[PDB]
Amino acid sequence: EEKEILWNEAKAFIAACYQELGKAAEVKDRLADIKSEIDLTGSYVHTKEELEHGAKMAWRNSNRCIGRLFWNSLNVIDRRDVRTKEEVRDALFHHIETATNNGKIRPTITIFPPEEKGEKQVEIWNHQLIRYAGYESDGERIGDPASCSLTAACEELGWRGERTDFDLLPLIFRMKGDEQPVWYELPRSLVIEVPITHPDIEAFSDLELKWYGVPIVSDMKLEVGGIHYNAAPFNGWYMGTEIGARNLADEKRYDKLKKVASVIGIAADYNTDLWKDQALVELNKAVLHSYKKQGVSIVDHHTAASQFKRFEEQAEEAGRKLTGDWTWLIPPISPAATHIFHRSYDNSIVKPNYFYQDKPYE
Amino acid sequence: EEKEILWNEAKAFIAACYQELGKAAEVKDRLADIKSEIDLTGSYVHTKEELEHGAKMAWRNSNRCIGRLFWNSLNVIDRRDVRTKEEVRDALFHHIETATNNGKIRPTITIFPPEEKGEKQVEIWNHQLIRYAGYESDGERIGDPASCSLTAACEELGWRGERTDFDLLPLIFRMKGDEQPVWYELPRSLVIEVPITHPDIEAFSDLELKWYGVPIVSDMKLEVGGIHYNAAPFNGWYMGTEIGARNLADEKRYDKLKKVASVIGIAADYNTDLWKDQALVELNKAVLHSYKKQGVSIVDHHTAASQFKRFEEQAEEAGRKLTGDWTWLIPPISPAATHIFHRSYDNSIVKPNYFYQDKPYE
Numbered sequence A, B: 001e002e003k004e005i006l007w008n009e010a011k012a013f014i015a016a017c018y019q020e021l022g023k024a025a026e027v028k029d030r031l032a033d034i035k036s037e038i039d040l041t042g043s044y045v046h047t048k049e050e051l052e053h054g055a056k057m058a059w060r061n062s063n064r065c066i067g068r069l070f071w072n073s074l075n076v077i078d079r080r081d082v083r084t085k086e087e088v089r090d091a092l093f094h095h096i097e098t099a100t101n102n103g104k105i106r107p108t109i110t111i112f113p114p115e116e117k118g119e120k121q122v123e124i125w126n127h128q129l130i131r132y133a134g135y136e137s138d139g140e141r142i143g144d145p146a147s148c149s150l151t152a153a154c155e156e157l158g159w160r161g162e163r164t165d166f167d168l169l170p171l172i173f174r175m176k177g178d179e180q181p182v183w184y185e186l187p188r189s190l191v192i193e194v195p196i197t198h199p200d201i202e203a204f205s206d207l208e209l210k211w212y213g214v215p216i217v218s219d220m221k222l223e224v225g226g227i228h229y230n231a232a233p234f235n236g237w238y239m240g241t242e243i244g245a246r247n248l249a250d251e252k253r254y255d256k257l258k259k260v261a262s263v264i265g266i267a268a269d270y271n272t273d274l275w276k277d278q279a280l281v282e283l284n285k286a287v288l289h290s291y292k293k294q295g296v297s298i299v300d301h302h303t304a305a306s307q308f309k310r311f312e313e314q315a316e317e318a319g320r321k322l323t324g325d326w327t328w329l330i331p332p333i334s335p336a337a338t339h340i341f342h343r344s345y346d347n348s349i350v351k352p353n354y355f356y357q358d359k360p361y362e
Ligand code: HEM
Pocket: A055, A058, A059, A062, A064, A065, A066, A067, A068, A070, A074, A107, A108, A109, A234, A235, A236, A237, A238, A239, A242, A299, A304, A328, A354
């Protein structure tokens, strides 16, 4: 039953994975041994090669991701050997260091032991390994509102933030058998941040905006051939609009457009002046400029869409069906300036893939 | 069979239409008489009141339309009495005049006789009553590429354009019984156009851009209670982005962003400079400024989204289900700056509604 669905997903994955690796012949025996290990044990164990390719396929199949051209060069770190919270912490620290790579970001995933009985071995509470805390009480809003619930959970466990607008949340995760998670403060030497300045407008620094270099999503489940890696943080580099058109711009996030309008010297009084649009463009130019100036990888939405067009072309040429989520693939500024806006995408779910899972806080 | 589907749609419409008009009691008899007229004749005839309300409901149910707040004030002109091509022409001329209203645009629909046996009485070839011709031959591109096929069809019928970038296409329609359509040149006195200037950048006029005041979509079918009004042109006013972010901006339309970049004095060499985004913002500011300066109705995308939020609220308060097409409701610039981007919409089709129909050219 469980064994059944596990077997089925395993067959589909192993077949596909071995064709892609040019190892079509080895399938039958590999499949045989898997059916055996399943019947005996209730599960099976991926080889390094299978796991690495599975993680790459999962990225390739992520409908909402514009950055998929580079799927085959994902750096996969196999940490299925960790057993202790010190080891998990150190693995997370290491992921940050190697992914950051002095600013020349390496798309990386660290893979922890998978769910056994549906029982998690390691459960990471962070949404991203590096993210800012958020506070809300007494009309007072500080930091990132998206982080309010996790921040509150951390402070329930004895952590205390400085209540700056950019407090780094601690790493926070729970081990199987432990009733509570543990938290560890981030060593600042590991975390690159970028001050936001503008190429022409000197006053832009008065806003004292910054953002972190490397987004490392740590709360999604990687599913490969029926195996559920609920703990498998991965990172790429940012597309500039994620920071400039959302994280810093949304009313429910840092909500900076009025302040941007003021420093760039335009009125924020009339919808018809398109001051929000103008503020968005200057804020987004500033973000790209700032990351490039500091030597931290980033991509603008036009270049990213051009890369994605090549991904589409490669899928076709390889005989692979393309799947995508138009509503997430279009960038949140000038979307009609990209080819993406002007076609449609099949939003079907293909596995291996990355999936949402319920937050253990909230 | 035909009578069946006709009866079914009629029941659903008459019931709904009479509740909304507070005439719930009159339904049963009205329904009875309709069933009779159907059985005898194979069809039925809408009262003025039914037709007017049906056209308003159809607009209310148009998923892709951000402008629906004003559905109940649509100006409905009943022209089911026309029989001759002179009458059709004059009705179209009149629609242009009354809708334009010296620049204070009145949302208007002119309704011609419906399909009888599925046989069209009047067939309008124009996509909009006012639109620019487009030419393409010998590497030479002139005017609006979207109009190339209709332009070619007009010139097959003896029309000849001046081959300016803004030739007004003639009205072109066919009568039942006629093998070919007829065409009539638009009287220039009927057509308001707006030169595009910028509020701060004087050189912007060097681009010699203009657009027409009133978009009057004339090739969609209005369906009400099983009756198919294939000829029923309607208009609102423009949302500025339709002109500034699409008609003038798309590479497959007027493709003006590079020229915009040049006149506003920025380089168009690096994706990371976001010059396309900046050019879009200035072009869109110019469009809104120009229409307002001339006293021609227009709405910006922020105000339009705010109006649409009220439409959502009204639907709720009236107990009506809301339907929408997120992919068409978001504006093509700064969509994440609108509430629309941050929620989802049920894309179900509810009738009465406006529908696509096959082009008789192409
Ligand atoms: C190499 C640079 C990369 C860029 C520039 C990039 C860009 C993006 C962007 C802009 C989004 C949309 C996020 C949003 O708007 O909220 C996204 C979504 C996503 N990306 Fe990528 N990405 C990259 C690499 C990766 C990698 C390495 C993985 C995993 C191996 C990945 C998996 C995903 C997934 C799963 C989503 C969807 C998340 C969700 O549904 O909530 N991407 N990507």
